[PDB]
Amino acid sequence: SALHWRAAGAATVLLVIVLLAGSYLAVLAERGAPGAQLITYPRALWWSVETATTVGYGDLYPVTLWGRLVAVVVMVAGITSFGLVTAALATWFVGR
Amino acid sequence: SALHWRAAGAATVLLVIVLLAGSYLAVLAERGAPGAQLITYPRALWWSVETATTVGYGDLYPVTLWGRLVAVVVMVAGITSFGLVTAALATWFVGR
Amino acid sequence: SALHWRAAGAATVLLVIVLLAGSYLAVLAERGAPGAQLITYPRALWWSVETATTVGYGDLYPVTLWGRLVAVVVMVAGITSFGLVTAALATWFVGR
Amino acid sequence: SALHWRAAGAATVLLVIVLLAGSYLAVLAERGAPGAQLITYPRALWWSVETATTVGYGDLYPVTLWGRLVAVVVMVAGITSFGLVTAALATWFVGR
Ligand SMILES: [K+]
Ligand SMILES: [K+]
Ligand SMILES: [K+]
Ligand SMILES: [K+]
Ligand SMILES: [K+]
Ligand SMILES: [K+]
């Protein structure tokens, strides 16, 4: 457990924190906007996961300024996490 | 065939197993839920592929707890597999 | 121009070939299926690009067996290409 | 701050420039086309972000030649940027 494992390990933990907080903040931001569908927590968590994994079906998405702002954080933290693990497994193989 | 090839090789094999099992379990989980479209195996397999590749058009997606839970596994195993191959080809080039 | 550049270079070239051929074969496969929207070449090329980049909005997608089969090739060749360039730039930085 | 940091650093800066310019050029290209929804700047910026991150929900997408052409640049610059950072963190861990 040097640096190339603690980084990916913390990123995975941080990601889960972002997913939980992101789904919570999304509901807070999306409510008050007529037509918004991202207004309940259980499906907001499902949205955050498919957002952080860059899947993004289209069944759920933010339509507000702060809602979309929260979404961007979920994307970046998502790509970084899934990208930091990739760079982690790369360094592992290089050192044999 | 050291470690940086057996890992990506097994990941590719494991991915296919996840895609097949994921498409099967998705149908089992989605059926019983009014309005769900992911309820037949042939298109479920197509959904699993576009899910694991993080494409996610929006033509098919789970709407149940366990259905979405299966989806998350397909995503993670998908990103990992396509990410483990990337880290595999990286190590190959580093060692010249 | 060793191996970690010719690989990514060929992948980029191969990708364009897949995009052109994929868009052509998609139209051939999707036509004959009632309701299919991926039935003209100019927008098929646009679909292939957003497919290979794993974006996948949902404005265009295959609904046939062979159409979806062509799509999978576009995804895999897409992820590999954009992934082989990433592993190429990684090796470049490692060697200083 | 050698090469494996200035590259990812410039890519991040360049990405923001592409997102801003891309959202601007998208509106210019999409307007004049009946049915197009990507016709205002604030939501165009939101579209560019979810495009560069390869999320692509389906709530917004270009339907014109030049609009889709701008989109491709946003995708490529997006994948490259998020990919150049990944290759940056990889080299960092390899050198210990
Ligand atoms: K996507
Ligand atoms: K979509
Ligand atoms: K994606
Ligand atoms: K998508
Ligand atoms: K959609
Ligand atoms: K990726």
- CATH number assigned to the domain comprising residue C75: 1.10.287.70
Q: Which H helix or E strand runs over D20? A: helix D6-30
Experimental determination technique:
X-ray
Q: Which of C89, C28, C90, C93 is nearest to C62 (CA)?
A: C28
Question: What is the rounded CA–CA span in Å between residue B1 and residue B5?
Answer: 6
Distance in Å, CA D80 to ligand 5 centroid? 25
Among B56, B59, B90, beta carbon nearest to C87: B90
Could you list which residues have their CB under 5 Å from ion ligand 4? A 56; B 56; C 56; D 56
The token pair at D33 is 């086309």
Is residue A29 within 8 A of residue A70, CB to CB? The reply is yes
| Partner-chain contact B58 C58, CB within 8 Å | yes
**Counting Cβ atoms within 10 Å, is residue C73 exposed (0-12), middle (13-18) or buried (19+)?**
middle
Q: How far apart are the first and last CA of chain C?
A: 15
Task: Name residue, tokens 């990684």.
Answer: C90
| Partner-chain contact C46 D68, CB within 8 Å | yes
Angstrom CA distances, A85 to A10, B36, C67, stand at 10, 34, 33
Is residue C18 within 8 A of residue C73, CB to CB? The reply is yes
| Partner-chain contact D76 C54, CB within 8 Å | no
Question: What is the rounded CA–CA span in Å between residue D90 and residue C18?
Answer: 29
Expressed in percent and rounded to 5, the helix, strand and coil fractions of chain D are 70, 0, 30
Chain centroid to CA B69: 12
Amino acid identity, residue A65? L
Is residue A87 within 8 A of residue A81, CB to CB? The reply is no
Chain D residue numbers with beta carbons less than 8 Å from the beta carbon of C44 are none
Task: Name residue, tokens 């929804």.
Answer: D37
Neighbours of chain D (3+ CB pairs under 8 A): A, B, C
Closest chain C residue by Cα to residue B47: C68
Q: Which of A10, A4, A14 is nearest to A88 (CA)?
A: A4
- Angle between helix C41-52 and C6-30 (nearest 10): 130
DSSP letter for each residue of chain B: --STTHHHHHHHHHHHHHHHHHHHHHHHHHTTSTT----SHHHHHHHHHHHHTT---SSS---SHHHHHHHHHHHHHHHHHHHHHHHHHHHHHHT-
Mutate to test the interface with A, among D45, D54, D89, D94 (most CBs of A within 10 A): D89
Contacts of C16 (CB under 8 A, 6+ apart): none
Question: Where are the extended beta strands (E) located within chain A?
Answer: none
Could you list which residues have their CB under 5 Å from ion ligand 2? A 58; B 58; C 58; D 58
Task: Name residue, tokens 């990739």.
Answer: A86
Chain centroid to CA A60: 14
Residue C30 DSSP label: H
Query: Sign of dihedral through CA atoms A67, A71, A73, A74?
Result: positive
Q: How many separate domains does chain C show?
A: 1
C32 dihedral zone (left: phi>0; alpha: psi -120 to 50; beta): left
> φ, ψ for residue A34 (rounded to 5)?
-55, 125
Question: What is the rounded CA–CA span in Å between residue C7 and residue B56?
Answer: 28
Mutate to test the interface with C, among A4, A51, A86 (most CBs of C within 10 A): A86
Chain D residue numbers with beta carbons less than 8 Å from the beta carbon of B56 are 56
Question: What is the rounded CA–CA span in Å between residue B62 and residue C96?
Answer: 46
Question: What is the rounded CA–CA span in Å between residue B78 and residue B82?
Answer: 6
Angstrom CA distances, D23 to A67, A69, D13, D28, D50, stand at 19, 16, 16, 9, 11
Q: How far apart are the first and last CA of chain B?
A: 15
Contacts of B7 (CB under 8 A, 6+ apart): A89, A93, B84, B88
Determine the structural domain holding residue A42 and report its residue range: 1-96
Is residue B84 within 8 A of residue A89, CB to CB? The reply is yes
> Resolution reached, in Å?
2.8
Question: What is the rounded CA–CA span in Å between residue B95 and residue C25?
Answer: 39
Question: What is the rounded CA–CA span in Å between residue C79 and residue C53?
Answer: 7
Chain A residue numbers with beta carbons less than 8 Å from the beta carbon of C95 are none
For residue A10, the tally of other CB atoms under 10 A from its CB is 12
Question: What is the rounded CA–CA span in Å between residue B12 and residue A61?
Answer: 31
| Partner-chain contact C72 B49, CB within 8 Å | yes
Question: What is the rounded CA–CA span in Å between residue C27 and residue C36?
Answer: 10
The token pair at A6 is 């603690």
The token pair at C39 is 């039935």
Q: Which residues of C9-25 are buried (b: 16+ CB within 10 A; e: fewer)?
A: eebeeebeebbeebbeb
Angstrom CA distances, D24 to A72, C94, D19, D30, stand at 19, 37, 9, 10
Query: ∠ CA(D78), CA(D80), CA(D84), 5° rounding?
Result: 125
